[PDB]
Every structure is written in C-alpha cells, then in structure tokens.
Specification:
The structure is a homodimer.
Chain A lengths: L3 E6 L8 H16 L4 E6 L10 H6 L9 H19 L2 E5 L9 H10 L6 E4 L2 E4 L5 E6 L5 H11 L4 E6 L12 H14 L1
Helix pairs in contact in A: 1-6
Bound molecules: flavin mononucleotide (FMN) (6 copies).
Subunit structure (chains A, B): Homodimer.
Catalytic activity (chains A, B): 2 a quinone + NADH + H(+) = 2 a 1,4-benzosemiquinone + NAD(+); N,N-dimethyl-1,4-phenylenediamine + anthranilate + 2 NAD(+) = 2-(4-dimethylaminophenyl)diazenylbenzoate + 2 NADH + 2 H(+)
Function (chains A, B): Quinone reductase that provides resistance to thiol-specific stress caused by electrophilic quinones.
Chain lengths: ~190, ~190
C-alpha cells in the first residue's frame, strides 16, 4: 500500500492500439517495481462516457429540480469518476493524438470530471483546483498543441505534477516478440522509477 | 449567387447560447450586406454527429468488407458533411471554449470530415489539403490553445484563409433589447464587409 494507481485508456484501436500496448507495459513495469501498489484500469473506449450535451450539462450543476433518467445517470457517473480520481495517487493517462486533439473518449471523461465546486472552485483570488496531491503520467504520441492543453486542463483541477512520455515509435506495429516490451522498458524507466 | 455560406453551430446552450446568438447576428448581417448569397446552417447540437469510435473509424477508411448498419450510416454521414463543406465558399464556425477545448459537438464533426484520401492526401512532398478555395470565419470566445488548434486543423485540410472573431462579451447574458445586436454589428463589421 504505497500508491494507488489509476490507468485511463482512451484509444479506439483496442488491442492493436499502440497506446494501449504501452499502457499495459507500464502496468507490468510498475507492478514489478512497486509490488504492493494497487493498480486499477478504466478503459474509456470499452466503457464509453457520454457526450456532454445540453441535457447533461444541466445535470452536472446544482439545480434542485427533478432530473431525467439520463441526467441522473450522468450525475452519478460524474460523481463516480471524480471519486475514483480523488481515491488514486498516480493517474496514468493514455492520450494518443487524433486529428490534432485528444480522443473524444478522453475528452468526454474530462467533461464529466471538470465541475465547478467539485474539482475546482472560484475563490476571491481566482480559481483553484481541488484534485490535490496527485502525480499524472501522460502516455502520448508526437508529430503539438495536445501537450500544453493537457498540462493546462490538469493544472486547472489541481494537478501540477504532470509528466509526459512520447512513444517515439515504440509498439507502433508488427514486431518480433519481446522487442516492443524491451523498448518500452527503456522508455518508461524514468516514470516507473 | 455570389457566395454560398455554411454556418456550423456547436454550442450546447441552445437559444441562450452566446455563440448561437452571435451566429444568428452574423447571418442577419451577411444577408443584409450580400442579398444574393445562399446561407445554410447546420446545428451540430440539434443534430448530433456520432463519436468516432473503433467501429466508426473502420467505416471511414477503404475496406471493401460488409459494414454494420451504423458503419454504413457514418460513412454516408461523413460523405454528406464533406460534400456540404466542398459545396460552400464561406465556412462560419461557432466554436465556444468548453474546458479549454472545442465543444465535442464540433469535434465529432471534425472527426467525420478529416479523412485521408478525401479531404487531405499524402503526396511525395508531404500531406496536402483537398478542401481548397475556402474562407473560414471562426466565432469564438477567449480567456488559449483552441485558436492555434483550429488554424492547424483547418490548414491541414486545405483552408488557410482562417479569420477569428472573439466575442468580447457580446451577447453574454441578460441585456436590454437591441443592444447585443448593435454590439455584434460593430464586432462582425470586418468579416461581413
Ligand atoms: C483517427 C486517428 C487520428 C489520428 N490522428 C493523428 C494526428 O492528428 N497526429 C498524429 O501524429 N497521429 C495521429 N494518429 C496516429 C496515433 O496518434 C498514433 O497511432 C498514436 O501514437 C497511438 O494511437 P493508438 O493508441 O490509438 O493506436 C491518428 C490515429 C487515428 C486512428
Ligand atoms: C517531457 C516533455 C514535456 C513537454 N511539455 C510541453 C508543454 O507543456 N508545452 C509545450 O508547448 N511543449 C511541451 N513539450 C515540447 C517541447 C514537452 C516535451 C517533453 C519531452
Ligand atoms: C531473427 C529475427 C526475427 C524477426 N521476426 C519478426 C517477426 O516474426 N515479425 C515481425 O514483424 N518482425 C520480425 N523481425 C523484425 C524485427 O521485429 C524488427 O522489425 C527489426 O529487426 C528491428 O531492427 P532495428 O532495431 O534496427 O529497427 C525479426 C527480426 C529478426 C532479426
Ligand atoms: C461546459 C462549459 C465549459 C466552458 N468552458 C470554458 C472554458 O474552459 N474557458 C472559457 O473561457 N469559457 C468556458 N465556457 C464559457 C463559454 O465558452 C462562453 O459562454 C462562450 O463565449 C460561449 O459559450 P456558449 O455559446 O455555449 O454559450 C464554458 C461554458 C460551458 C457551458
Ligand atoms: C484575429 C486573431 C487571431 C489569432 N490567431 C492566433 C493563432 O493562430 N495562434 C495563437 O497562438 N494565437 C492567436 N491569436 C492570439 C494573439 C489570435 C488573436 C486574434 C485577435
Ligand atoms: C433605459 C434602460 C433600460 C434597460 N432595460 C434592461 C432590461 O430590460 N433588461 C436588462 O437585462 N438590462 C436592461 N438595461 C441594462 C442594459 O442592458 C445594460 O446592462 C447597461 O445599460 C449597459 O451599460 P454599458 O454600455 O455601460 O455597459 C437597461 C438599461 C437602460 C439604460
């Protein structure tokens, strides 16, 4: 019981995903280096988060009105995702670049967790994040506005320890066995240690 | 028949939307200044575009396989949206900032229109955009990584004439009648003329 680690997968390419392969290598390496740690994984493609629309945005703010079933479900989901984030110490986010942005799968997660009065709040001296004491490790790809955006968003909710890892080709495609794993060990050595 | 104008709305706040109010003022002003022009409007919240997932990404690339009904529907939708874009000369995009990104409503549109071999293609000298001869006017808000992202994405598909307008408070909220409209006339004067 040294750290609780939450891994967020967002790729839409399932098991052939480069970033999912990297996330799995990360998990293996973390387990080996930190035997007592509790790792959990949320796959945002396998269990999609709904799109923030007019109906759902109303569910996420204080109202006091009766809510539709889908509103109730979104509010409960948001609460669950936020509790999950707060319960973990290390947040590993697999965020491949899709059309110069993050995957929508991850964006929908962000739109559920960014809630005023819950994960940030306004004070007399500006906004402050309420998700404190976290370490975030971002597994991404490069070719880049996604990186400063991730730093800004995570910072806004209180996460300033944000560490980016760029898959410089590791686990790209067809590869003799053992090779991607070894290359990933080299890549992830810094963040795992 | 001087220009064909396509307006894309993406706000989730419906008629109370600042950016929808601005888009409507834009339409009124454009109509007045360019009586012969054909304007059409696509509201990406009122008619949502599906999320790009594993199933839909497969529908958008050449395969030659049988496709699921939702894949067929996404391919047809993508084709329709792309034909619409190509058929218009002036593309007006209302893109308010939501959690430091564009609305998902607009992002899903982008994920349907960004297709290799259709709206861009690779050549021996790098990628080139295939949506040529367009003028894009972006109606947005400021507090900013959304702006360079929009320029990059639109540029990638071939649109280099990209003009940003920042609603410096215009049509924010409760307002005596006629005022937002007058302020919008001042704001939009440059892009309309
Ligand atoms: C729909 C789609 C869009 C993509 N867009 C970009 C892009 O804009 N820039 C880029 O460098 N790579 C892009 N890629 C490649 C991925 O970012 C690359 O595979 C990444 O390292 C891992 O993606 P994956 O984990 O989903 O396989 C795209 C891939 C897909 C499927
Ligand atoms: C680890 C790492 C982090 C980076 N973070 C940022 C960043 O926050 N903003 C940026 O514009 N570029 C960034 N870059 C690109 C130089 C980063 C590059 C690396 C290798
Ligand atoms: C003995 C041997 C067996 C290989 N078997 C495979 C294979 O089964 N499938 C595959 O995709 N690549 C295979 N490769 C290719 C490697 O995965 C890789 O593409 C290449 O050897 C890496 O060379 P590099 O480190 O200089 O980039 C094999 C390579 C060697 C030397
Ligand atoms: C869910 C949501 C998230 C928002 N996030 C931001 C933000 O990150 N930065 C900002 O300046 N304004 C933000 N806004 C305010 C809108 O960008 C502002 O109202 C914009 O000018 C027009 O939005 P609208 O057309 O949807 O009303 C947000 C509004 C909503 C509803
Ligand atoms: C009209 C206009 C366009 C702008 N375009 C960009 C841009 O493309 N990239 C950027 O970083 N800042 C941009 N900015 C912010 C300076 C822009 C500001 C204005 C007023
Ligand atoms: C005669 C008069 C009537 C107004 N009626 C309304 C109103 O019905 N509803 C409203 O929200 N604001 C109303 N306002 C306020 C204006 O919309 C606006 O908030 C303010 O007058 C703008 O002042 P400014 O240009 O210095 O910012 C009214 C203002 C005046 C002078």
């Amino acid at each position: 019981a040294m750290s609780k680690v939450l891994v967020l997968k967002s790729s839409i390419l399932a098991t052939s995903s480069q970033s999912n392969q990297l996330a799995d290598f990360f998990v293996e390496q973390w387990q080996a280096a930190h035997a007592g740690d509790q790792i959990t994984v949320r796959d945002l493609a396998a269990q999609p988060i709904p799109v923030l629309d007019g109906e759902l945005v109303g569910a996420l703010r204080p109202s006091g009105t009766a809510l539709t079933p889908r509103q109730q479900e979104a509010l409960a989901l948001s609460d669950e995702l936020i509790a999950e984030l707060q319960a973990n110490d290390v947040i590993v986010i697999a965020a491949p670049m899709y059309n110069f942005n993050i995957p929508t799968q991850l964006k929908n997660y962000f739109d559920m967790i960014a809630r005023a009065g819950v994960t940030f709040r306004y004070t007399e001296k500006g906004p402050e994040g309420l998700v404190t004491g976290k370490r975030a490790i971002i597994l991404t790809s490069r070719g880049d506005l996604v990186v400063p955006y991730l730093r800004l968003f995570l910072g806004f909710i209180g996460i300033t320890d944000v560490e980016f890892v760029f898959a410089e080709g590791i686990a790209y495609g067809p590869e003799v066995a053992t090779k991607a794993q070894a290359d990933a060990k080299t890549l992830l050595a810094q963040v795992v240690a």
